Structure 1
Amino acid sequence: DESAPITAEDSWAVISAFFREKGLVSQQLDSFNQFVDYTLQDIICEDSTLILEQLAQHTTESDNISRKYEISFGKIYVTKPMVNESDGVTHALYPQEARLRNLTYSSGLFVDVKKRTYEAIDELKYELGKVFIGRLPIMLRSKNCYLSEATESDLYKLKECPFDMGGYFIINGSEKVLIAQERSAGNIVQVFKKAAPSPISHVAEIRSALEKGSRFISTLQVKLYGREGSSARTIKATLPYIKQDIPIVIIFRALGIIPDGEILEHICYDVNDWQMLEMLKPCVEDGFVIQDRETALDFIGRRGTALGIKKEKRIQYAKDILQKEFLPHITQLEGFESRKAFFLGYMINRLLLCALDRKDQDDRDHFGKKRLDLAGPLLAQLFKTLFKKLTKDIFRYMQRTVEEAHDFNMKLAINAKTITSGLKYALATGNWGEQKKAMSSRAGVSQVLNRYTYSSTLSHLRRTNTPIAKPRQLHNTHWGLVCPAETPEGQACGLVKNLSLMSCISVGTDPMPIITFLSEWGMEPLEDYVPHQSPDATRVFVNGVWHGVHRNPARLMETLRTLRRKGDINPEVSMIRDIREKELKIFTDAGRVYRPLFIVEDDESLGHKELKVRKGHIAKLMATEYQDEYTWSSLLNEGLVEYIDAEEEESILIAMQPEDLEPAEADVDPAKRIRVSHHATTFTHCEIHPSMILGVAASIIPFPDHNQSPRNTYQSAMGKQAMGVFLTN
């Protein structure tokens, strides 16, 4: 009977395993680790190498000598935490010594540097170690921290409390917690109705930004001029570095899509839909003046910039803007006009779809469209601006030392204090930016960890800040991800979110294994799309980048789901199939809040649709519970349980209780609350336990289902100020 359905008490055996593995601050640690193991290297390699060329006067010896010098950055190293005492000696440093001597719990950052030299005469370049760069503060309990592989008895000897959970830094002896910052997800197409007094009635916006590398915060607006009842309703778009909004047509022409109808094919996918097509006639009339690719680029080039007078100059510009500043996600490469044209057309399709009252205006408050910037990405943002600060100070040195041939001394070149004190400042003060000249910088990003009570400490490491439509309200999308009660009263009410117990935040994976997988599984590339040939084609996106289309999504979706539930596709990756809209969006993306749910399958030889997890797995876990071989990961790879973010939640159907919401009806207690039914035969998932919708503080409230809504909101604020033993140490 090891394949018997699971009861309601059994959901706790799964919850036990979730916490045995993840702990209460998996988000804080998993973020930092990702930044140390991967993110750090990629930051050293984006701009990385810098060169200086000294080309002569070509008069006569000692002239006519052209040289080019290189400086390259290879592997990045990072020691265990250390300290440099006054008397030279460097030695290991444990968290307790840091807190008492007010030191910083940081470790050394070391990078392989190489310095090449080249030379030519009056075209042929011919050729003629590990350096310390800074001290990076470590987050306690992370991979790099001493306390990570520490046993219980170990911690006690180290004068640390085993109940301490890590997730903070130690800067000058005070504990500091990075607060997750909530921002709107980028590379996302959103349509909004521009209010009653406006020339423009609707706008299609895309906040395009790179996953890493400079991060061009250029937002493209696709504007529908004219109001509901105004003649000549044209569509123009505001392009980065271009003062005026160019009529869509000219953009397509400048892209290479020259005749109307070839242009129309990219926007409207149904040749039948006369309604949308009539709406495009004004645009065609607007772009009638420009007839070829060249004249389109000139028209774009005319409208500066400044203007930048000269015919050859303006046409050359528009080329650069379309390549480097227009739709920078997708590609910033050359020959990708086809990709960026179809995207613009997908945007115009969405702009018109909303204006034709077929789709709703985008919910600016949908949680699925929000990201959380944790300790990882926060340090990554800071380290970028701090490493480009160092990179361009070495260059200033290479000029100073090639002028006087003063022997390019390494220690004089790299200023360690740049990155060391640059991070120490942020973490200490809290103005997340460079440096003692901060504003606007975002203060309160780093703050001193609440140590009043143990619960107070826990709830501080799960706190979310939202800076600046109706944000304070509890959204439906906040279900299972954020606590409905734990929020402040006054000013910050509903802008300070607290994570539910089972909530985790996507660390950010690689998109290529999925893009490579897709093409191989029937995905026709956008570069060869012919809308009227395959008109029912499901459009496939990976991080707001339209990669192509697929003819039988039904089978593809099942393959991709089996890929995740096996482990082949990472479980933190979100994949959604909106059948009605004919779309398949995939997210490898960092910052997405997810929750784990039980998987339910129609798949059962014996009877109905039943929860994959059986009483045999439950005992298989409680066997491992008695041992203190079957972990949470074990349930995850056996595809019994899955991770679902808010966007994916949209397409699923969840049962609250397993047992109570599974077998149909073939007296009743009056004292129990009135409950609904398991009418659904469609159930894709089941709720592990509904109490998990609550955060750390609300989870101490006895019978919160018997209190008036705010009385609960009050307790999850007061318990933070209740006295008790905060730590055994």
Structure 2
Amino acid sequence: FDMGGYFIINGSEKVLIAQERSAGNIVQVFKKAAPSPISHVAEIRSALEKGSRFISTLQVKLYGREGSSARTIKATLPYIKQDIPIVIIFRALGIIPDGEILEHICYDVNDWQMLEMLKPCVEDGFVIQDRETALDFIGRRGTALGIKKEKRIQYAKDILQKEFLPHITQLEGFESRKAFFLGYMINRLLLCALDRKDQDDRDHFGKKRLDLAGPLLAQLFKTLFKKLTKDIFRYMQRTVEEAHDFNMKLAINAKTITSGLKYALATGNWGEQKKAMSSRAGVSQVLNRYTYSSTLSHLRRTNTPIGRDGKLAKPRQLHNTHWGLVCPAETPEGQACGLVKNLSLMSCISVGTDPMPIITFLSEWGMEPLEDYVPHQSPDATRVFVNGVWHGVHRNPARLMETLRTLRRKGDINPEVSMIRDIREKELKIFTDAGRVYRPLFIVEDDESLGHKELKVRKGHIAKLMATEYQDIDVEEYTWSSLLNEGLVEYIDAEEEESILIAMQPEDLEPAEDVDPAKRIRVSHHATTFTHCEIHPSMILGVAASIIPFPDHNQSPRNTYQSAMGKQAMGVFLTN
């Protein structure tokens, strides 16, 4: 009955709590308070997975209040002491004419409101009219201030090549892509400033990622393996300065990796021992073995590292996007209420896949490359994103989404990959990275034979599943992966869940619609355009809440109390 999933460090069973964090490579726009001189800030926490994995925050801020007359947009580049005007950045990237810059930022000629709001930027940046002059300006504003005049250009180029939007590319010759993304960021900022879209919700669970054991151990090992390789160099240089024979056994030091991993798993302090008091604590905890359900709930626990003494209540509240992903009533009741969460029964976390095959698929299926994209000649084009990197535009997104869905439902694309089509915003976002939380659902198709919407799964598939289960307790095994590979069930995360319509139960909602007065009142929703169906509503509950009998006849704090108090119940935690 033991399920595993934990480490044994010095004879103690240690479990790694999932760590919640904000998603990377996503443009988020936030309104600022009245006292601050900046009104709106558009930021991206750019990060690259196959490189230095360093966090470099780009913030495109909009100075001036609503009543102010001088509304200038300024970007905050890393390793720069001052917020450079955006038009100077465009000119430094290699876009001199103002017409081209305003084309990059704004995609609609008839949108004269945005041009009116954006004219102060070009008025401010008129003083610079040359790419080399713009690089000189950035170097002059460069915080190093330890470079001679004609060598400032090299430092500015290095900043714009390796520090500005690293998640796009670190190589040279890709200035247009970065300029396009900067224009997109400024476009989002102005759309928020123009009272056309709301500020991004920080609590949206589709904008969060859970680091499981994998990524945590991955970044811990990188620091430890960096220290070992650096120590080989100091020895190699010392043993080469002394002109002695070099032996590989003497160079390596296994104690480094061994002690680092053992210390990081034995204590919550997640990093190097000397870097304690600055490292996150409580990542690794002693596994609870009071009761079997206590062990299960501990192995499915997620923590959000917000203070715990902070007096803000919004992170703790149960958000709408938590539906089906975390237990609605299974939180601790002290200072960690809402900050510590528990996964639902059927919610999973992606492990991440390589995005290159999907990029090849998109290029094959007719994605126009971003390098030669002219918005004026293609006004009604849909932007295609992969893992937050804008790769190009498509002119027939409907057929593209149809073929991507067909590919994912036959197993060609990994089922963990999440594809979202925002029709109103005209965007296509594909995510393959790790950390996304998803759940399975039934797929509903047209079913022209019956002339009305119906679930794809039928009694034949249920019979095959029952037969396979009975044999387990010979035919081709009909497992869960059989349903997944045959396009009967689907994996949906909180991002894709924004763009679907779900039926709560198949019987009362799929078919077109004297009643028992004892039965609860239900509605038919008076609408038939469903795309998916819930496998069962009771799967929104977690491990601890799934023990409660008739939880829907109870007041919710009582259910929370029982979910917290069943882990203290006394029983048989293991048979051995």
What are the superposed Cα offsets for residues 643-666 of structure 1, whole Å, 9 maximum, x if unpaired? 00000000000001111111113x
What are the superposed Cα offsets for residues 470-523 of structure 1, whole Å, 9 maximum, x if unpaired? 110000000000001000011100000100000100101001000111011110
Provide the TM-score with structure 2 as the length reference.
0.97
Q: Report the CA distance between 1:342 and its aligned residue.
A: 0.5
SS in 2 for 1:597: strand
Distance 2:275 2:39 in 1: 42
SS in 1 for 2:442: strand
- Find the partner of 1:684 among 523, 531, 534: 531
Task: Check the 8 A contact 1:664/1:678 in 2, yes or no.
Answer: no
What are the superposed Cα offsets for residues 44-68 of structure 1, whole Å, 9 maximum, x if unpaired? xxxxxxxxxxxxxxxxxxxxxxxxx
Counting aligned pairs with the same residue, the percent is 100
User: Which consecutive unaligned segments of at least 5 residues does structure 2 have?
Assistant: 307-312
SS in 1 for 2:508: coil
SS in 1 for 2:196: coil
Task: Check the 8 A contact 1:655/1:678 in 2, yes or no.
Answer: no
Q: Report the CA distance between 1:195 and its aligned residue.
A: 0.6
Distance 2:563 2:274 in 1: 36
SS in 2 for 1:660: helix
2:114 maps to 276
What are the superposed Cα offsets for residues 339-358 of structure 1, whole Å, 9 maximum, x if unpaired? 00000000011000011011
Distance 1:212 1:495 in 2: 31
Task: Check the 8 A contact 1:186/1:208 in 2, yes or no.
Answer: yes
What are the superposed Cα offsets for residues 551-599 of structure 1, whole Å, 9 maximum, x if unpaired? 0000000111111111111000011000000000100110000000000
Between 1:601-610 and 1:334-343, the stretch displaced more is 601-610
Q: Report the CA distance between 1:680 and its aligned residue.
A: 2.3
Give matches, 1:495-510, under 5 Å. 495-510=339-354
Task: Check the 8 A contact 1:308/1:314 in 2, yes or no.
Answer: no
Distance 2:195 2:342 in 1: 36
User: Which consecutive unaligned segments of at least 5 residues does structure 1 have?
Assistant: 1-162
Q: Report the CA distance between 1:605 and its aligned residue.
A: 2.3
Q: Report the CA distance between 1:679 and its aligned residue.
A: 2.2
Q: Report the CA distance between 1:411 and its aligned residue.
A: 1.3
SS in 2 for 1:460: helix
Q: Report the CA distance between 1:436 and its aligned residue.
A: 5.0
Distance 2:143 2:228 in 1: 31
Do the aligned partners of residues 292 and 437 (structure 1) sit closer, same or farther apart at CA in structure 2, a change above 3 Å counting?
closer
Task: Check the 8 A contact 1:449/1:457 in 2, yes or no.
Answer: yes
Task: Check the 8 A contact 1:210/1:328 in 2, yes or no.
Answer: yes
Distance 1:413 1:680 in 2: 71
Provide the TM-score with structure 1 as the length reference.
0.77
Distance 1:212 1:703 in 2: 49
Distance 1:507 1:367 in 2: 17
Distance 1:436 1:241 in 2: 27
Task: Check the 8 A contact 1:251/1:296 in 2, yes or no.
Answer: yes
SS in 1 for 2:499: coil
Task: Check the 8 A contact 1:455/1:697 in 2, yes or no.
Answer: yes
Regions of 4+ moved over 6 Å: none
Task: Check the 8 A contact 1:429/1:446 in 2, yes or no.
Answer: yes
Task: Check the 8 A contact 1:566/1:639 in 2, yes or no.
Answer: yes
Between 1:713-722 and 1:214-223, the stretch displaced more is 214-223
Q: Report the CA distance between 1:406 and its aligned residue.
A: 1.8
What are the superposed Cα offsets for residues 103-147 of structure 1, whole Å, 9 maximum, x if unpaired? xxxxxxxxxxxxxxxxxxxxxxxxxxxxxxxxxxxxxxxxxxxxx
Distance 2:232 2:52 in 1: 19
What are the superposed Cα offsets for residues 653-709 of structure 1, whole Å, 9 maximum, x if unpaired? 0001111111113x0110011001152221000000000000000000000000001
Report the count of equivalent residues: 566
Q: Report the CA distance between 1:332 and its aligned residue.
A: 1.0
SS in 1 for 2:233: helix
Task: Check the 8 A contact 1:604/1:610 in 2, yes or no.
Answer: no
What RMSD, in angstroms, separates the aligned Cα atoms of the two structures? 1.1
Task: Check the 8 A contact 1:593/1:645 in 2, yes or no.
Answer: yes
Q: Report the CA distance between 1:213 and its aligned residue.
A: 2.3
Q: Report the CA distance between 1:224 and its aligned residue.
A: 0.8
Give matches, 1:16-415, under 5 Å. 163-415=1-253
SS in 2 for 1:519: helix
SS in 2 for 1:271: coil
Distance 1:602 1:659 in 2: 16
Distance 2:350 2:233 in 1: 37
2:460 maps to 616
What are the superposed Cα offsets for residues 582-619 of structure 1, whole Å, 9 maximum, x if unpaired? 00010011000000000001243222011100011011
SS in 2 for 1:671: coil
Between 1:587-596 and 1:311-320, the stretch displaced more is 311-320
Distance 2:44 2:273 in 1: 31
SS in 2 for 1:191: strand
Q: Report the CA distance between 1:197 and its aligned residue.
A: 1.1
Distance 1:659 1:582 in 2: 34
Q: Report the CA distance between 1:437 and its aligned residue.
A: 4.6
Between 1:669-678 and 1:387-396, the stretch displaced more is 669-678
Distance 2:273 2:219 in 1: 13
1:481 maps to 325
Distance 1:259 1:394 in 2: 52
Distance 1:351 1:603 in 2: 44
